[PDB]
Write a protein that binds this ligand. Structure first.
Ligand code: CDL
Ligand code: CDL
Ligand code: 3PE
Ligand code: 3PE
Ligand code: 3PE
Lengths: 606, 168, 99, 459, 176, 50, 63
């Protein structure tokens, strides 16, 4: 209990060190990118050990480090819950951010504030590690908001671009909408349990706990991407490919699913939460893949695919398979980062163009990234053993083996096919056709800072599922008893999607003009969700803020009523009483009226 | 650390049964740790404890004589009400700490048992429910301006109803 | 129209005092003012303030309270008594009104 | 306490018989030393409170207000320095004396024991503020602003005086903790309801209720930076202190004679956070922010719970610091551009790359980024109001959203676009104002590390 | 980005711009170069079929109908070059496009390096306080007194005079 | 030098005057010096507690 | 701006570094105190009830 805890806190000390050199004067006399990358490397090597000790013993720990406050029977302290989830996610995220820092030192040259970029990356990593290892809702909220703000600071790197800022504020807005529910849950737990710690909160397994779960579900829809709060993730492609790869493929988007797995001891007995999960996550697998079938940008395609996979993980959460959802979280990062990686390689090789309609022959002009892209696409589709299988196969088996909703059970698979559809689209329009890009050619992918990270993430994407699934413990019994048309459905339908895509893409030839259609227009313009919501809701909110509150109430009526009325009244009475002309006759007649009134008062009351 | 206040039950740790022929890193890693982290830090703490031992100092836990309660405290005499209210605030704070101790005693048991907390973590939950009932009967709905007099009014507004129940 | 001076014009300070600090045009006074600020606000108050406040002991009895609560829990759990009762005041000394 | 007040009284001669070159330096240094000495009040080793005389006293609620008051002084000295720089030595000595008098009276009224002394000082706080706002403002509506401020305050304060007399007659004293150890319940009659109204309206005006918030935006927009700072930090807190002290005797009336103000606060919160989206004046935006934040304080005093009072105190101090910081940040630009219009100057963070951080952190606080005392207050107010009634969370979330919106709006329309390249008069950032911002921030870090000094009476 | 629109576009300009947009959206629709060339030739035939026509009313009618056909058959996700509006690089380096006057506030120990640079910057001003007065007269004297005016500017007609209002078209930052 | 550096004797003099007046105030209020039902001591080590 | 940062660091270190050194040397050599029952006769002081040497020193000497 000395080696485990020391190894747990050492990674935080290390991650902090760079930011300490960021305040010192050594930056201008150090290679900050290389130093930070080595820090991340050693942090990963350190985090590898707790993983071994857990795989061996299966022992979880709670570590309270510092007393912050004592509020009248309610303590608050720094508390880390080192469990399977935390210790595995830490290793995965560090192993990924290593590759990402290297590829960033490659991709962001000519940017003077590359030091600032690296600092922000490591700060986000720290916030995510807090979120992931928190044994306390307040610490988890710290991580939540740190992620949400690092997103604003990274989407916005190019603060002259008037669209990156719109995207940043969009993310802020949606994540605050999720924070609403997060705070609702925190309040319910603080009142009905006088605590904020998983330990005490786990004694509400018999209580009703529907309102806090609704709150957490809203927070998950927010931080992750689901049909109600999804659009901010595609609009996050306005930022550099490294942050698109870290904050939007592997981290900052599995946060809600991590929340729900941490709170799985309470969703196990609420068939209204599990049933809105299963009927919502599936509504995104379909609605985004559709969107990912007629978009022309590699980044947007990848983001929509990420959203679809997240819907799939929410589906397997609803079907009561939290460990499976988390296994997918962890086996998804490898290839959904290597894909952004090869995308950014292709882009920086060309003249900063992301539209597939102006690239081709990559399979021959750029073998390395083509091979890695194909590997990632296969792993994503579900090829029998490339880190996709070990999670997606079990998910797609449980989906049909459980008693479920028979429309989700269908659209989930339709989207699982659209996966291979748009993957084949990428493959065919970027790596199989003729070079419809400009004529000047300065391709170069022979830089180790680019070759080694992808090599590494590819070894990962190939062997991580094996290495994990054959070491983790069996916290759930699966069903290996079923017909062939359920045991092979994922593979079969991925193949059918590939073939349908081959056909419909070869039809892109044949000199037959492309008559626009409403289906494709819908899938292209996002179902118009943004185009309409982001135009009505602002208009109403703002026309109200202006014409009603500021104008009608404040600058008009709350003036007309109190102060202007006082002034009018007193000025009028002033005029009345000071309209006097110096006439002694009138003054004395008034004196006489006064005398009469006084005599009368006296003689009457008496 | 008094183990009676903080139980910390014992630890049933088993024998390592390496039914294989391939080595185990964790063991040699722990040995290397013992050699290159423990040894020097232990020596340093020994040195610091030496300095302590040679310049020790002692500090005492302050005792508080008991003063009259609100019950024997007249309806407007403040020299007594001050003493009584200070005493009540003191006991209120100590009760806060008691409840915090119970909760710190329950979280540990939950984390320890794990999947057996629904069967092996029951007496602690019962102590928690009981002390919760007591805290509720004493201090629940007083308000920001809580005081011994409001606590007394609560006590009486409870006891009159309990007396009605008793008689019928 | 009427008699009045004309609106004045902006005035760069760095032109004459590139070592400007913000306080006064006189360079030595500027420097000594910034020095006094930095040495009385940062070097003393924040530092010694933080030190004193951190080494204020037993702020509002939150420590003695924990110690005494441990003592009480021990005493009571040892003598079989309960850890806390439902009535602060003993209902003997109290004298209720009879309806 | 007298060791805090006598030196503050001596800062005056120092100011007047100091040479025209060392007065600023000397008075600022000694003000910092006063801020330092004021930390004796934090030596609270027991639950017993301090009582130095029949006239003075300190509590866990009055100590932080007092220390913030003694800390803000040298900051206002430093900030009122670039302007009134050409102004005559005599005039600037007058300014310094006004500031010092405000300091002394605020310390007195926070350390007071008697409601009527509290009253005379809470009403003497008007002269220096009015004089600063009218004699050193730049517009022509500062006169009307002072009228509004002065007379709102006095119209609210008269019935408070009358109620204090009624009490001093029924009971024989206005002394605190005696009004506590002898308080009685009431009859729930109309006379006592009007007593409640009287006792409260003064403070409900001095911290702007929604409907009588029409003196704060004026005063801010028309006042100089030191006036803005003190108004945002402490003058909005006198009401909170007064209500936290006077609500002990009005029981049990506030259980039902508080609904209208809870409603007005929870609604005006939204209806001002929204103005913070479509206001053009940066100063008025920050004023409406102050209003939307004080609404929570009001609604939390109204419900009388320990968590509520704790959050009220935390948010009081935090908002004080943050509003002062934001006001000084806007002033840094005003001194360079002479226009409060926000959308005029843009694309900063290019020539002022560091002040864009202070701009950012002051925004991270206002939108309650954890870990921070702004949030440690908002959260507990939210929990208290959720226990009160679960439907308050709706309005709380709406306000949270609008805050997160307008903070980043204020950030982006000033620091995160592209530059107004036609701005030749962007004198680089002064060490003085960078130091202002640092002195504002660092104490927030320290109070976030040790928020045990900031909970209040209950905790 | 270098000129100003005229008070009104002429039928020729309208038709040319419609042709350009139609071809760009044809490119968007047809991903392959062979297809693009095929249908571009087809479209140019469709156009040339009505080049020797002169009836202005029927011409405007054909144009009003072709614009509607375009709005009905336009690609909703067309290709935009990166550095152009709607592109992924529009206003991306405005963060580093710092103006020139930001160097008048530099500190002697900052211009102590790049001394050969700042010496030129100086005489570039000497070339400005002298070339200013005559740039006004050339506008005063070249003014249309009949009221009419537009956003054009003349060159200098001398040896030594410089184009009026040059300092901001010159001296502007790189695009990078 | 004094005509410009004698103004450093006021504010510390004020601090000391304040401490002195506090001493006067607590020389008053002497009653209950040892008659508190909580801190009734026996004057064994000294002659005046406070 | 580099000037302001340098001066802030200088003037904070100037008086924090010696403070930190003193605190470290104190906590090493002197060390916190240890809980001890009260001799039935002795009357403890208002400072022998605290723990940290600096706390009880400030108490003994100024409170
Ligand atoms: C629950 C978990 C448990 C742990 C809790 C931890 C807390 C919660 C963590 C979650 C936080 C969520 C929020 C994260 C996002 C925050 C936003 C942000 O990063 O702002 C940008 C901010 C500034 O970066 P930038 O935007 O690139 O600006 C650079 C400038 O252009 C200029 O560049 P430069 O080259 O000049 O850089 C030199 C540097 C120079 O830095 C300094 O000079 C700092 C002074 C050091 C003093 C050393 C003497 C001792 O200047 C700066 O970069 C920043 C200037 C502003 C100063 C920032 C001061 C921050 C508050 C410090 C409090 C002081 C406390 C000690 C005071 C002691 C008093 C007794 O990022 C930082 O580098 C600061 C790190 C803050 C992270 C704290 C959390 C640590 C984990
Ligand atoms: C060969 C190999 C040799 C290596 C062997 C290991 C070294 C062993 C050794 O040297 O023993 C030292 C020796 C060992 O004694 P010991 O056995 O540990 O006995 C304990 C002491 O009696 C206890 O006395 P103490 O109370 O004075 O201990 C020092 C004190 C230090 O602090 C102080 O109170 C005094 C220092 C204040 C600094 C003032 C100067 C400011 C200018 C800079 O500790 C603290 O209070 C920790 C403060 C925590 C600050 C950072 C916390 C960040 C929290 C962020 C807030 C947000 C949280 C959100 C969470 C939300 C969850 C719901 O003496 C010390 O322990 C004192 C060392 C002083 C370290 C100062 C640096 C600490 C870092 C923070 C302050 C930065 C300044
Ligand atoms: C109350 C009056 C209110 C008025 C405000 C104006 C104040 C002006 C006067 C100057 C300030 C005087 C002192 C301020 C309080 C200092 C508190 C302190 O001394 O720190 C104490 C702390 C140990 O705390 P202690 O109570 O002894 O032990 C129990 C656990 N707290 O020991 C320490 O932690 C000290 C070490 C400090 C290290 C700082 C490290 C920063 C860490 C980053 C945190 C970031 C959190 C904020 C991020 C979001 C903010 C936007
Ligand atoms: C060069 C710059 C100098 C700045 C100071 C540098 C050292 C850092 C000190 C800062 C930390 C202390 C801050 C808090 C001071 C408050 C404590 C205090 O002043 O106690 C009051 C004490 C009078 O003690 P009293 O019992 O009333 O009378 C007996 C006379 N022997 O009176 C005193 O003890 C005087 C304390 C001096 C305060 C300054
Ligand atoms: C632009 C706004 C308008 C500005 C112009 C203001 C016009 C002033 C109103 C005209 C005068 C009407 C008030 C007459 C007061 C009547 C006496 C009274 O109400 O006192 C009763 C109560 C004490 O009664 P009690 O102790 O129970 O026993 C009997 C007395 N020993 O003691 C009390 O309740 C004291 C009551 C004092 C008067 C309170 C006035 C209303 C308070 C709420 C609003 C305050 C804002 C200013 C007034 C707005 C208009 C009312």
């Amino acid at each position: 209990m000395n080696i485990f805890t020391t190894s747990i806190l050492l990674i935080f000390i290390l991650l902090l060190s760079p930011i300490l050199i960021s305040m010192s004067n050594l930056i201008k006399h150090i290679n900050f990118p290389l130093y930070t990358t080595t820090s991340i490397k050693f942090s990963f090597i350190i985090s590898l050990l707790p993983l071994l000790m857990f795989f061996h013993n299966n022992m979880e720990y709670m570590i309270t480090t510092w007393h912050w406050v004592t509020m009248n029977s309610m303590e608050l302290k720094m508390s880390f819950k080192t469990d399977f989830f935390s210790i595995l996610f830490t290793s995965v995220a560090l192993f990924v951010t290593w590759s990402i820092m290297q590829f960033s030192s490659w991709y962001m040259h000519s940017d003077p504030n590359i030091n600032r970029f690296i600092k922000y990356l490591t700060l986000f990593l720290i916030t995510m590690l807090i979120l992931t290892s928190a044994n306390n809702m307040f610490q988890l909220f710290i991580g939540w908001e740190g992620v949400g703000i690092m997103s604003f600071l990274l989407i916005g790197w190019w603060y002259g671009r008037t669209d990156a800022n719109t995207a940043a504020l969009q993310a802020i807005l949606y994540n605050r909408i999720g924070d609403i529910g997060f705070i609702l849950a925190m309040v319910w737990f603080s009142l009905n349990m006088n605590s904020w710690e998983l330990q005490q909160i786990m004694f509400s397994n018999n209580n009703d706990n529907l309102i806090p779960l609704m709150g957490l579900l809203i927070a998950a829809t927010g931080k992750s991407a689901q049909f109600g709060l999804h659009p901010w993730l595609p609009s996050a492609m306005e930022g550099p490919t490294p942050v698109s790869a870290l904050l939007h493929s592997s981290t900052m988007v599995v946060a809600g699913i991590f929340l729900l797995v941490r709170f799985h001891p309470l969703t196990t007995n609420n068939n209204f939460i599990l049933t809105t999960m299963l009927c919502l996550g599936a509504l995104t697998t379909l609605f985004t893949a559709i969107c990912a079938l007629t978009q022309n940008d590699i980044k947007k395609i990848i983001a929509f695919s990420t959203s679809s996979q997240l819907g799939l993980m929410m589906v397997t959460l609803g079907m009561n398979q939290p460990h499976l959802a988390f296994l997918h979280i962890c086996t998804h990062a490898f290839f959904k980062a290597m894909l952004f990686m090869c995308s950014g390689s292709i882009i920086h090789s060309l003249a900063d163009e992301q539209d597939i309609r102006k690239m081709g022959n990559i399979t021959k002009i750029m073998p390395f990234t083509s091979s890695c892209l194909v590997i990632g696409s296969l792993a994503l589709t579900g090829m029998p053993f490339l880190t996709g299988f070990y999670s997606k196969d079990l998910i797609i088996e449980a989906i049909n083996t459980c008693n479920t909703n028979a429309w989700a059970l269908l659209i989930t698979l339709i989207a699982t096919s659209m996966t291979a559809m748009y993957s084949m689209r990428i493959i065919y329009f970027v790596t199989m056709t003729k070079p419809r890009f400009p004529p000047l050619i300065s391709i170069n992918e022979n830089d180790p800072d680019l070759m080694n990270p992808i090599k590494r993430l590819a070894f990962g994407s190939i062997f991580a599922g094996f290495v994990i699934s054959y070491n983790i413990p069996p916290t759930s019994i699966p069903v290996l008893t079923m017909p062939w048309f359920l045991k092979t459905t994922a593979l079969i339908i991925s193949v059918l999607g590939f073939l349908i895509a081959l056909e419909l893409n070869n039809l892109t030839m044949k000199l037959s003009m492309n008559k626009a259609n409403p289906y494709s227009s819908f899938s292209t313009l996002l179902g118009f969700f943004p185009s309409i919501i982001h135009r009505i809701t602002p208009m109403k909110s703002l026309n109200l803020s202006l014409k009603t509150s500021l104008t009608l109430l404040d600058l008009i009526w709350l003036e007309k009523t109190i102060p202007k009325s006082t002034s009018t009244l007193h000025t009028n009475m002033t005029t009345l009483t000071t309209n006097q002309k110096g006439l002694i006759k009138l003054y004395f007649m008034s004196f006489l009226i006064n005398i009469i009134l006084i005599i009368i008062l006296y003689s009457i009351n008496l | 650390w008094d183990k009676d206040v903080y139980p910390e039950p014992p630890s049933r740790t088993p024998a390592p049964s390496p039914q294989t022929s391939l080595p185990n890193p964790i063991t040699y890693l722990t040995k290397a740790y013992d050699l290159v982290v423990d040894w020097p830090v232990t020596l340093v703490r020994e040195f610091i404890e030496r300095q302590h031992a040679k310049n020790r100092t002692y500090y005492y836990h302050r005792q508080y004589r008991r003063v009259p309660d609100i019950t024997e405290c007249k309806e407007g005499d403040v020299l007594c009400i001050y003493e009584a209210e200070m005493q009540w605030r003191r006991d209120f704070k100590v009760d806060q700490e008691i409840m915090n101790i119970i909760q710190e005693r329950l979280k540990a048991c939950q984390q320890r048992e794990g999947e057996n907390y629904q069967q092996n973590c029951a007496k602690e939950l019962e102590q928690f429910t009981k002390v919760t009932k007591a805290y509720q009967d004493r201090y629940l709905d007083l308000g920001a301006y809580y005081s011994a007099r409001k606590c007394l009014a609560k006590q009486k507004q409870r006891m009159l109803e309990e007396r009605k129940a008793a008689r019928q | 129209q009427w008699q009045e001076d004309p609106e004045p014009e902006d005035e760069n300070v760095y032109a004459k005092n590139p070592d400007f600090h913000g306080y006064d045009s006189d360079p030595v006074v500027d420097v000594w003012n910034m020095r006094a600020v930095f040495f009385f606000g940062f070097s003393i108050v924040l530092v010694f303030g933080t030190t004193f406040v951190a080494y204020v002991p037993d702020y509002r009895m939150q420590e003695w309270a924990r110690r005494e609560a441990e003592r009480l829990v021990k005493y009571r759990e040892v003598n079989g008594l309960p850890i806390m009762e439902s009535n602060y005041f003993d209902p003997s000394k109290i004298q209720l009104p009879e309806d | 306490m007298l060791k805090i007040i006598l030196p503050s009284l001596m800062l005056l001669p120092l100011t007047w018989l100091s040479s025209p070159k060392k007065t600023w330096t000397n008075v600022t240094s000694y003000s910092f030393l006063i801020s330092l000495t004021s930390l004796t009040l934090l030596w609270q080793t027991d639950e017993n409170y301090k009582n130095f005389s029949n006239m003075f006293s300190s509590d866990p609620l009055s100590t932080p207000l007092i220390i913030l008051t003694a800390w803000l002084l040298p900051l206002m000295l430093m900030a009122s320095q670039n302007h009134l720089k050409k102004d005559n030595n005599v005039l600037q000595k007058l300014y310094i004396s006004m500031l010092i008098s405000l300091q002394i009276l605020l310390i007195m009224t926070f350390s007071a024991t008697e409601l009527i002394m509290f009253y005379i000082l809470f009403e003497a706080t008007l002269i220096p503020t009015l004089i600063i706002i009218t004699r050193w403002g730049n517009q022509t509506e500062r006169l009307n602003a002072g009228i509004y401020f002065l007379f709102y305050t006095l119209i609210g304060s008269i019935p408070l005086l009358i109620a204090l007399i009624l009490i001093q007659n029924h009971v024989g004293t206005l002394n605190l903790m005696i009004l506590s150890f002898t308080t009685h319940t009431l009859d729930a009659s109309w006379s006592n309801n009007l007593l409640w109204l009287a006792c409260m309206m003064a403070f409900l005006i001095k911290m702007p209720l929604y409907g009588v918030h029409l003196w704060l935006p004026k005063a801010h927009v028309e006042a100089p930076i030191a006036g803005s700072m003190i108004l945002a930090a402490i003058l909005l807190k006198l009401g909170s202190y007064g209500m936290i002290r006077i609500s002990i005797i009005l029981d049990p009336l506030t259980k039902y004679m508080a609904y209208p103000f809870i409603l007005l606060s929870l609604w005006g919160m939204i209806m001002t956070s929204s103005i913070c989206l479509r206001q053009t004046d940066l100063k008025s935006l920050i004023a409406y922010s102050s209003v939307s934040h004080m609404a929570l304080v009001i609604a939390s005093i109204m419900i009388q719970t320990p968590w509520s009072f704790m959050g009220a105190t935390m948010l009081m101090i935090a908002h004080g610091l943050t509003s002062s910081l934001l006001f000084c940040l806007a002033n840094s630009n005003y001194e360079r551009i002479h226009s409060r219009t926000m959308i005029m100057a843009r694309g900063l963070q290019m020539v002022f790359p560091l002040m864009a951080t202070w701009w950012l952190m002051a925004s991270l606080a206002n939108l309650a980024l954890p870990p921070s005392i702004n949030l440690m207050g908002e959260l507990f107010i939210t929990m208290s109001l959720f226990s009160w009634s679960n439907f308050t969370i709706i309005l709380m979330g709406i306000n949270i959203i609008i805050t997160g919106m307008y903070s980043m709006y204020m950030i982006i329309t000033t620091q995160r676009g592209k530059l107004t390249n036609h701005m030749i008069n962007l004198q680089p950032s002064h060490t003085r104002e960078l130091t202002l911002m640092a002195l504002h921030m660092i104490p927030l870090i320290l109070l976030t590390t040790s928020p045990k000094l900031i909970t209040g009476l209950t905790m | 980005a270098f000129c100003a629109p005229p008070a009104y576009l002429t039928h020729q300009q309208k038709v040319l711009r419609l042709y350009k947009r139609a071809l760009r959206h044809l490119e968007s629709w047809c991903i392959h170069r062979d297809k693009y060339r095929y249908f571009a030739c087809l479209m140019r035939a469709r156009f040339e079929e009505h080049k020797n026509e002169k009836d202005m009313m029927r011409a405007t009618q054909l144009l009003r109908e072709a614009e509607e056909e375009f709005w009905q058959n336009q690609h909703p996700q067309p290709y935009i070059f990166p550095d152009s509006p709607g592109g992924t690089s529009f206003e991306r380096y405005e963060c580093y496009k710092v103006p020139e006057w930001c160097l008048d506030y530099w500190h002697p120990s900052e211009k102590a390096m790049y001394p050969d640079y700042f010496s030129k910057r100086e005489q570039w001003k000497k070339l400005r306080m002298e070339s200013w007065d005559r740039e006004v007269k050339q506008l005063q004297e070249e003014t249309s007194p009949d009221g009419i005016m537009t956003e054009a500017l003349p060159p200098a007609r001398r040896e030594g005079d410089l184009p009026p209002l040059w300092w901001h078209i010159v001296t502007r930052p790189r695009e990078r | 030098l004094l005509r410009e550096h004698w103004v450093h004797i006021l504010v510390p003099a004020g601090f000391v005057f304040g401490c002195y007046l506090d001493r006067k105030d607590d020389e008053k209020l002497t009653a209950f010096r040892n008659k508190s039902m909580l801190f009734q001591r026996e004057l064994r080590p000294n002659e005046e507690v406070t | 701006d580099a000037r302001f940062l340098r001066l802030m660091k200088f003037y904070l270190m100037l008086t924090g570094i010696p403070v930190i050194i003193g605190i470290t040397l104190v906590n090493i050599f002197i060390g916190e105190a240890e809980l001890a029952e009260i001799p039935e006769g002795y009357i403890p002081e208002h400072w022998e009830y605290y723990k940290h040497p600096i706390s009880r020193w400030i108490a003994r000497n100024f409170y």
